[PDB]
C-alpha cells in the first residue's frame, strides 16, 4: 500500500533472488563477479548491492553453509565453497537442489556446545526452534531423523549410540571421525559466535537510498 513498504519488499525480494542465484552458481561450480550480479539480478537497484549482497551472503552461510569469499579484489570475483572446509554438502542422489551443510553445522555446533556428546532430546530441542521436527519432511532440509541417524552417520560426521547403562533406552550424538578430521570444536564454536554476533544490515529507506545516489 505504501511506497516505502513496497520499496522494502522490492529489496527483500532481491535478497531472496540473489540468494537463489548464488545457490545456482554454487551447484554449477562456477565463479561469480559483482558485475554479473549487478546486471543479472539487481539491475534496477545497483547502488543497493552492499545491502542485498550482504544479506544474501549471510543467508547462504546460515541456511546452506556456503561461504561467498572474494577471490580477486580488483576483479570483484567470488568463489562459493562449503563453510569450515567440510567436504560434504548433501548434493547427492535425489537431493540436487538444497545443500545440507548448514544443518549439519548447527548439529555439530549443538554437540560441541554440550561437551563430549549431546542427548537426543536436546538435539530435537535445538532443531525444533528452526521448525525441524522428527518424522516431518522440512521443505528445505528434508526429514531430520534420517539425516541424523543414517546420512550423517554413514558419512562418518556423527555417531548415534545408546547411553552406557540406560534404563530404559536412551540415545545421544557425538562427532564422528570425519568431523574431527575436517574441523574442530574450537573452529565450529567460533563460527557460531561469529554468525550470532554479526550486526544486522538494515534495509535503506527511500531517502537513505537517495543519498547513496
Amino acid at each position: 500500500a505504501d511506497a516505502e513498504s513496497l520499496f522494502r519488499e522490492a529489496l527483500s525480494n532481491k535478497v531472496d533472488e540473489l540468494a537463489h542465484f548464488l545457490l545456482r552458481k554454487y551447484r554449477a561450480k562456477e565463479l561469480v563477479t559483482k558485475a554479473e550480479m549487478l546486471e543479472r539480478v539487481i539491475k534496477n537497484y545497483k547502488r543497493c548491492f552492499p545491502v542485498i549482497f550482504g544479506k544474501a551472503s549471510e543467508s547462504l552461510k546460515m541456511i546452506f553453509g556456503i561461504d561467498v569469499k572474494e577471490v580477486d579484489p580488483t576483479s570483484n570475483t567470488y568463489t562459493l565453497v562449503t563453510c569450515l572446509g567440510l567436504s560434504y554438502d548433501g548434493l547427492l542422489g535425489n537431493n540436487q537442489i538444497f545443500p545440507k551443510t548448514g544443518l549439519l553445522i548447527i548439529v555439530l555446533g549443538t554437540i560441541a556446545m554440550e561437551g563430549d556428546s549431546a542427548s537426543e532430546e536436546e538435539i530435537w530441542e535445538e532443531l525444533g526452534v528452526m521448525g525441524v521436527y522428527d518424522g516431518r519432511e522440512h521443505t528445505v532440509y528434508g526429514e531430520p531423523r534420517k539425516l541424523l541417524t543414517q546420512d550423517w552417520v554413514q558419512e562418518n560426521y556423527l555417531e548415534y549410540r545408546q547411553v552406557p547403562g540406560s534404563n530404559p533406552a536412551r540415545y545421544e550424538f557425538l562427532w564422528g571421525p570425519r568431523a574431527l578430521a575436517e574441523t574442530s570444536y574450537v573452529k565450529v564454536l567460533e563460527h557460531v559466535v561469529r554468525v550470532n554476533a554479526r550486526v544486522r544490515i538494515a534495509y535503506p529507506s527511500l531517502r537513505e537510498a537517495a543519498l547513496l545516489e
Partner: peptide, 20 residues
C-alpha cells in the same frame, strides 16, 4: 513473512540457542 524470510529467521534462532 515470505517463505525465504522465515527460513532465515529460523536459522538465526538456531544459532542463538547454541550460542547461549
Amino acid at each position: 513473512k515470505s517463505e525465504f524470510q522465515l527460513l532465515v529467521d529460523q536459522a538465526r534462532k538456531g544459532y542463538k540457542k547454541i550460542a547461549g
